[PDB]
């Protein structure tokens, strides 16, 4: 009862590594306009520092794979912690090299999936630690506060709402030894798939000349120079938090991978337009199956499966 677009959508949503190539070609919703589909894959080998904890965040930010930070062992991120990004390949070829040029090629986007996995590469004589994962509903909002200028006024800036879930481990979690690995996925948290705009001029959260106290965020997010990375929006997905611990005197090495099924709205003058096509038509059975399968999955599994 499933058409080919529905099967392809499910395949991109749930089982990336089990097939020769990515089969997804669009979201089979009512919308049937002109879109451009892009699949992002990152493959990096990382070695964790012994005697410390490492936190990895997987946020629905286009063009960025994950954000990471390190803290002393047995603690949690605090007001002095900062998260730095690791980009997908070809960020500048799509979002420019300036803070005021992020929307020179596309105008809108929407997410379909975002996956992750960790594969250890250590032998049976060095490894020590554990891996823990859990999910948090982080979204983007605004704050308002007065400024004692001449004459006085009021301000409005972007803030992140829901970051307090990182500072604790929820009842729903997956924890095992380090050598077993992990694999997890996210899902849409909205009753329908809609489009989001492309934000401009955002490099840090909170921005410049704004103190951390007046925004309410627990920690800071930094992307660095505007010619390397930045924030261009926040999709309607869920954030995955991964913590890796290592006792002093141990050696842990692994490989980190991330997938993404995404859609865009191209511009007539952009060079990406010639690769576009029309969105697939509606398929109710595919949507119902997607909802059921998304609801009926655990938080994470070991790397062997």
């Amino acid at each position: 009862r499933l058409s080919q677009p529905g099967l392809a959508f499910l395949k991109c949503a749930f089982a990336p590594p089990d097939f020769n190539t990515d089969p997804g070609k669009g979201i089979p919703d009512r919308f049937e306009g002109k879109v451009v589909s892009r699949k992002d894959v990152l493959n990096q080998s990382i070695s964790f520092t012994a005697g410390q904890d490492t936190f990895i965040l997987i946020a629905p930010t286009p063009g960025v794979a994950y954000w990471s930070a390190s803290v002393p062992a047995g603690t949690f991120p605090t007001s002095a912690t900062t998260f730095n990004p690791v980009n997908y390949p070809g960020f500048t070829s799509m979002f420019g090299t300036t803070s005021t040029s992020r929307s020179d090629q596309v105008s809108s986007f929407r997410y379909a999936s975002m996956n992750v996995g960790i594969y250890p590469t250590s032998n049976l004589m060095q490894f020590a630690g554990s891996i823990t994962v859990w999910k948090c509903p982080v979204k983007l909002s605004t704050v308002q506060f007065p400024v004692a200028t001449d004459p006085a006024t009021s301000s409005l800036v972007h803030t992140l709402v829901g970051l307090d879930g990182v500072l604790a481990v929820g009842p729903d979690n997956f924890s095992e030894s380090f050598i077993k690995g992990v694999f997890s996925q996210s899902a849409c948290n909205e009753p329908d798939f809609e489009f989001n705009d492309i934000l401009e001029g955002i490099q840090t959260l909170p921005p410049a000349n704004v103190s951390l106290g007046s925004t309410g965020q627990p920690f800071t997010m930094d992307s660095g120079a505007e010619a390397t990375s930045g924030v261009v929006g926040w999709g309607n997905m869920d954030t995955i938090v991964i913590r890796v611990s290592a006792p002093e005197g141990a050696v842990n090495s692994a490989i980190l991978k991330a997938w993404s099924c995404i859609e865009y709205r191209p511009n007539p003058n952009a060079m990406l337009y010639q690769f576009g096509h029309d969105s697939p038509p509606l398929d109710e059975v595919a949507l119902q199956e997607y909802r059921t399968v998304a609801r009926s999955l655990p938080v994470a599994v070991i790397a062997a499966q």
Partner: peptide, 14 residues
């Protein structure tokens, strides 16, 4: 595998 899990879930929900 994960695909087997998805197929079994769908078949049980079919």
């Amino acid at each position: 595998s994960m695909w087997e899990r998805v197929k079994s879930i769908i078949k049980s929900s079919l």
